[PDB]
Amino acid sequence: MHHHHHHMSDGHNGLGKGFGDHIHWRTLEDGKKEAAASGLPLMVIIHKSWCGACKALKPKFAESTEISELSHNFVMVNLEDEEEPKDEDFSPDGGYIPRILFLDPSGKVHPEIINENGNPSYKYFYVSAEQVVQGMKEAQERLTGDAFRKKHLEDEL
Template sequence: MAAGNIMKAFFTLIFDKVHCSSLSGRDNGFGNNYIWAGSLESGLQIATHHNKPVMVIIHKSWCSACKNLKPKFATSSEIQSLSKHFVMVNLVDEEEPKNSSFAPDGSYIPRILFVSPKGSVDHDIYNEEGSSQYKYFYSRPEQIAKSMRKVLEKYKHEQFDE
């Protein structure tokens, strides 16, 4: 019995280390004060394991709107504070997912989408102050923070790790 408990504790430790080691993503200009998942796949695994929603930023290195958003995002204390309740995923250039659920109303950039703790893209959370044609385009940190708060409110019945 004791040996079984030791093995279970060992595998739990290894499993947690594997999940947490995936948190080594690049900030790509969106701020090194955030903890970025290394990839969309690892972000989704971490989210499921820790029961947290995911914020996915899809952008291109050559995009002027993306370049404009980066310093605003990077220095937003409100987004930084809210980000502790999310798994943050930052996808640039070829890392953009091919799955159409990540381009619900087109493949413009930048796009910010939210994924439920269970792993499905939540198309109900979008920039309500933005364009009806480009619902997942955000140009100001206040818009992003508003959507982040909506996500946390929507999934508040879920238990989030601190």
């Protein structure tokens, strides 16, 4: 912030529209408004330069036809250089440019949830709907309702 204030532009905004359909790009608008009631976290998938998670998803993630309905589990967001944020929201526990990022219901990216099915030196990196779907069908049960943070924080008794 310098002096003026910004809120929204509403006009140009691209997203997951060449891989599956409506999944990791539903948008924070519908994802947040709904993430409040039902209470579901988001999966901000970001990809910059070349990007393989977008090309591989096209032929296979195109299978997300079922993932189009599975979204009832939660909602994600896909951004690119067009709206590249200025924080870990694009790359937390890594240096790539940009990869998949799971975050808390509200839009708070955190290196807490990655792609366990990914490579052993990338994690967040995605290259197949098969994995993003297991991480979808999984985190959707634990990541939602703070059911991922082990269990409790304290008690003493």
